[PDB]
Amino acid sequence: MSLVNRKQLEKMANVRFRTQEDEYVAILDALEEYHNMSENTVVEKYLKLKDINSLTDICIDTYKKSGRNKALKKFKEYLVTEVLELKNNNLTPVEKNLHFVWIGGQINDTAINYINQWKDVNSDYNVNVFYDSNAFLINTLKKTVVESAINDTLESFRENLNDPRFDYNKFFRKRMEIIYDKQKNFINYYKAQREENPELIIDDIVKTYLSNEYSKEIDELNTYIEESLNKITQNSGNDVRNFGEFKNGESFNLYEQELVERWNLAAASDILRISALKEIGGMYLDVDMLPGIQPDLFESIEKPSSVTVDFWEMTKLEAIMKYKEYIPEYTSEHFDMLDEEVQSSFESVLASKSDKSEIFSSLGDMEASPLEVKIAFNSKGIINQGLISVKDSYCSNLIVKQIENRYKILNNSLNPAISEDNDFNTTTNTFIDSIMAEANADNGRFMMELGKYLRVGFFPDVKTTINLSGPEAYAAAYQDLLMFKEGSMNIHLIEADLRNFEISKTNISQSTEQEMASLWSFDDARAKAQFEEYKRNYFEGAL
Numbered sequence: 001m002s003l004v005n006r007k008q009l010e011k012m013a014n015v016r017f018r019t020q021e022d023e024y025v026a027i028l029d030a031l032e033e034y035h036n037m038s039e040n041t042v043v044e045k046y047l048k049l050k051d052i053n054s055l056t057d058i059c060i061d062t063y064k065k066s067g068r069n070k071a072l073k074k075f076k077e078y079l080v081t082e083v084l085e086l087k088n089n090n091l092t093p094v095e096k097n098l099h100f101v102w103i104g105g106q107i108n109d110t111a112i113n114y115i116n117q118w119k120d121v122n123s124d125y126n127v128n129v130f131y132d133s134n135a136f137l138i139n140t141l142k143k144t145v146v147e148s149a150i151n152d153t154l155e156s157f158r159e160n161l162n163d164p165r166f167d168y169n170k171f172f173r174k175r176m177e178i179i180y181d182k183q184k185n186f187i188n189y190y191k192a193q194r195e196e197n198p199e200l201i202i203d204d205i206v207k208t209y210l211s212n213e214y215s216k217e218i219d220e221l222n223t224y225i226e227e228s229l230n231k232i233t234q235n236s237g238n239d240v241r242n243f244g245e246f247k248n249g250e251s252f253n254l255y256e257q258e259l260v261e262r263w264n265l266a267a268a269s270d271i272l273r274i275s276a277l278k279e280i281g282g283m284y285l286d287v288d289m290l291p292g293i294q295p296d297l298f299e300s301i302e303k304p305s306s307v308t309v310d311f312w313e314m315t316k317l318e319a320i321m322k323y324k325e326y327i328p329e330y331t332s333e334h335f336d337m338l339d340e341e342v343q344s345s346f347e348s349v350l351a352s353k354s355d356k357s358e359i360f361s362s363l364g365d366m367e368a369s370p371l372e373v374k375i376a377f378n379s380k381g382i383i384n385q386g387l388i389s390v391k392d393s394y395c396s397n398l399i400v401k402q403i404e405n406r407y408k409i410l411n412n413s414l415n416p417a418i419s420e421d422n423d424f425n426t427t428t429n430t431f432i433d434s435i436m437a438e439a440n441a442d443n444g445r446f447m448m449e450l451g452k453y454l455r456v457g458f459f460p461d462v463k464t465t466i467n468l469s470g471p472e473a474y475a476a477a478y479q480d481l482l483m484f485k486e487g488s489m490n491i492h493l494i495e496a497d498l499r500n501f502e503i504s505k506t507n508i509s510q511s512t513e514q515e516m517a518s519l520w521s522f523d524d525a526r527a528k529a530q531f532e533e534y535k536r537n538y539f540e541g542a543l
């Protein structure tokens with residue numbers, strides 16, 4: 001399992017009558033050094049392999065027709081394998097912290113109920129539910145602005161809505177234009193207020209705005225802030241405004257951009273979660289994730305052949321919540337579709353258990369490499385709804401830097417476009433023209449995903465966040481690690497590469513009810529059902 005020594009590499013890369021060139025010798029020296037590093041940190045050894053890798057590339061480029069290159073390229077594969085060896089063999093304890101994030105408003109009971117299942121089965125774990133005490137009204141601001149735009153849009157189309165099958169995309173298109181205008185109005189107000197009185201907090205500005213523009217009662221908004229603050233305080237709340245390292249770092253401006261300007265709480269949470277992991281260590285979880293089910297629990301019950309795996313995984317939790325009642329209002333939509341015999345097998349199994357510890361597994365003493373961040377997987381690949389990292393892991397730093405470099409590219413084209421104070425369509429075109437002029441061979445595909453940034457949260461199937469602060473930033477960091485580099489923009493890693501960094505599937509139950517409804521995005525199917533909902537809501541409005 002050891003990777004090659006100096007002599008073994010000289011045999012490999014041997015070419016009769018060719019002297020060892022300086023750049024060849026350099027690799028050889030560096031390799032022997034690496035084998036003298038028993039007492040060094042894993043990170044120190046990774047950095048050595050990184051330099052060995054860099055010296056190998058130099059040698060290859062310096063002598064492109066060399067009989068050594070075939071073996072040198074082989075040697076590079078060995079370096080990667082060694083990183084995985086290093087990663088898999090030098091494990092340190094994961095700090096016993098569970099980190100949840102809920103920002104922008106009051107947390108609901110169902111989110112708390114999911115959180116308590118984890119608490120209930122991981123008593124040795126300190127729980128953080130990150131919130132922003134300056135920013136409990138962002139969810140209200142977005143809701144009010146979007147509902148206002150919904151109404152203005154219907155009043156624009158009117159009877160044209162009847163006929164024929166009017167293209168519902170026209171609705172969301174016109175509504176985006178109105179949303180962009182209102183949002184710009186607020187952003188302009190926020191910036192004017194901050195520059196007039198830097199002591200003002202987001203919520204002060206938001207409630208004044210809501211009161212001025214939407215005739216909201218600030219007394220009521222005040223009471224909601226009060227209630228939200230109290231509730232999260234009682235539920236392991238941890239204020240972002242006290243997270244000093246995060247506040248003073250280069251990501252905080254990105255966080256606030258998503259929070260205050262774009263109203264994208266999932267993107268804001270993407271930025272927060274990884275800084276929390278870097279700075280504190282532990283395990284990050286989305287509030288719609290539940291503890292792993294005990295593997296032995298349902299073994300005696302065979303999945304019917306007619307039913308898919310993901311369907312079966314949903315019904316397991318639905319079975320649990322039906323008979324054990326751990327979480328109020330939990331759906332049994334799928335469990336109920338089953339044959340009565342299979343339902344009986346579930347209730348007989350669950351009945352033979354008296355404890356929640358017999359139902360959900362505990363996380364226990366986990367360990368992972370100082371090099372890595374482990375990430376959840378689903379049918380579509382990596383997903384950052386579950387993350388595991390020791391404090392200050394090398395990858396956590398790689399991910400933070402990916403996100404920041406991704407936002408730097410975004411904002412370089414976006415800010416000038418927005419500062420021309422034009423409408424949605426003009427702004428969009430200007431921004432895309434700039435994105436296009438700035439794209440090259442190795443970021444092209446990333447750039448194609450940015451063009452859509454301005455509609456995030458407001459138009460169906462706009463998922464740009466994924467490419468900016470979400471899963472693609474992690475894939476890119478992993479490529480950084482295994483490619484011995486920084487700033488990868490073209491992802492070429494395959495599933496098997498990324499599988500190296502996976503969280504064991506048994507540590508998380510992903511197929512939950514709340515996971516089936518995205519809070520920051522919505523698909524075409526959902527867009528259609530919203531649009532018709534809005535049509536009928538409005539018609540019933542004579543009240």
Ligand SMILES: O=c1ccn([C@@H]2O[C@H](COP(=O)(O)OP(=O)(O)O)[C@@H](O)[C@H]2O)c(=O)[nH]1
Nearest residue numbers: 101102103104265266269286287518519520
């Ligand atoms: O109003 C909100 C909505 C979302 N989130 C955060 O965004 C995460 C991702 O939400 P969701 O699971 O809906 O995203 P998805 O898995 O559908 O991409 C949540 O767990 C929260 O951390 C938040 O803090 N406030």
Ligand SMILES: OC[C@H]1O[C@H](O)[C@H](O)[C@@H](O)[C@@H]1O
Nearest residue numbers: 266286384385465466470471
């Ligand atoms: O990156 C956008 C989103 O991607 C994934 O769907 C994760 O579930 C979510 O937590 C994240 O916010």
Ligand SMILES: [Mn+2]
Nearest residue numbers: 286288385515
């Ligand atoms: Mn989710």
